[PDB]
């Protein structure tokens, strides 16, 4: 149950999520593109899902990839803002899941995003503890897929 | 031309958008639902598009509607944050349009949102000047449909 997953977000986890987000969420365009590029670099098999974005190897220069990257960050912003109210976190997560389910994205595939997040966090000096906190937030979405 | 539409967002318009957003964007859940219910009350002919959300008449009590309403506000948040850079504003507006275009929503359909926005702004003491500023932002999205 998505609600049960939301329980893993204890006070210390929510704190690490907010503190780290204050940084990685402060440069959505730069960090958003870094996440996407890292995803394509380490998981080439996921490139096929984003054919609409054109040539993703262009990075920042690709307007379509840039628009998708910036927008992706606002979905994370939404999750972070709803942390203190499980009911709101749950309804936004389920809404979010709808489009991804239609694209046939399984819970395991979605889990591939954990790697990119871990590296982006590290680039900002946030270690394993923070990556584990984010893995738990990602787990909430997986509970809905 | 989306770019010519975006060029209509002058210093004064951007300032008015920011000032009004500071207030309405501070309660995304409340104002988001108010916007959606005003849309359904004033333009019943649009309800058919949100069949997945169930009984939208329930307002805040409808979890699906609540999740959608909060999420909608983050798209507006995204647009406001890109006001400094027209190139970034345009790329997120076009990314945003993709799903609506797939749903067959036309520019005429999208312009119906001007009414609900004007009414919500007014309930917060923001008059004509602000409603006109938001209509210019909506025109940018329309140019992309
Ligand atoms: C932190 C994780 C993720 C977040 C926050 C996220 C966010 C988003 C957002 C906000 C959209 C735009 C609205 C929509 O159409 O759904 C989107 C689109 C999409 N996402 Fe996700 N996503 C995530 C992970 C993934 C993963 C791991 C995959 C697949 C490997 C995936 C595949 C897609 C695809 C194919 C699209 C459509 C892109 C297009 O064709 O323009 N997403 N995602
Ligand atoms: C200021 C204007 C609007 C904003 C900011 C907005 C924002 C959003 C967002 C963020 C989503 C979720 C991502 C996606 O699926 O694309 C969405 C979904 C949707 N929008 Fe829009 N939208 C706007 C106007 C409209 C209008 C006027 C219509 C139709 C007349 C419409 C119909 C839909 C539908 C049917 C969905 C899917 C709802 C669901 O099943 O969850 N939107 N919109």
Curated annotation (Swiss-Prot), chains A, B:
Q: Kindly state which keywords UniProt assigns to this record, in alphabetical order.
A: Cytoplasm, Heme, Iron, Metal-binding, Oxygen transport, Transport
Q: Where in or outside the cell is it found?
A: Cytoplasm
User: What subunit structure does UniProt give?
Assistant: Homodimer.
Q: Which organism is it from?
A: Anadara inaequivalvis
Q: What does the entry list under GO cellular component?
A: cytoplasm
Identify a single GO molecular function assigned to this protein: metal ion binding
Per the record, the similarity remark reads:
Belongs to the globin family.
| Domain Globin, first and last residues per copy | 8-145
Q: What is this protein called?
A: Globin-1
């Amino acid at each position: 149950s998505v609600y049960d997953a939301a329980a893993q977000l204890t006070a210390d986890v929510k704190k690490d999520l907010r503190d780290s987000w204050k940084v990685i969420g402060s440069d959505k365009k730069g960090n958003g593109v870094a996440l996407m590029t890292t995803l394509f670099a380490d998981n080439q098999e996921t490139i096929g899902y984003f054919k609409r974005l054109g040539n993703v190897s262009q990075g920042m220069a690709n307007d379509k990839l840039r628009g998708h990257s910036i927008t992706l960050m606002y979905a994370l912003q939404n999750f972070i803002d709803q942390l203190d109210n499980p009911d709101d976190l749950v309804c936004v997560v389920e809404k979010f899941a709808v489009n991804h389910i239609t694209r046939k994205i399984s819970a395991a595939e979605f889990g591939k995003f954990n790697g990119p997040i871990k590296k982006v966090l590290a680039s900002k000096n946030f270690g394993d503890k923070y990556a584990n906190a984010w893995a738990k937030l990602v787990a909430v979405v997986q509970a809905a897929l």
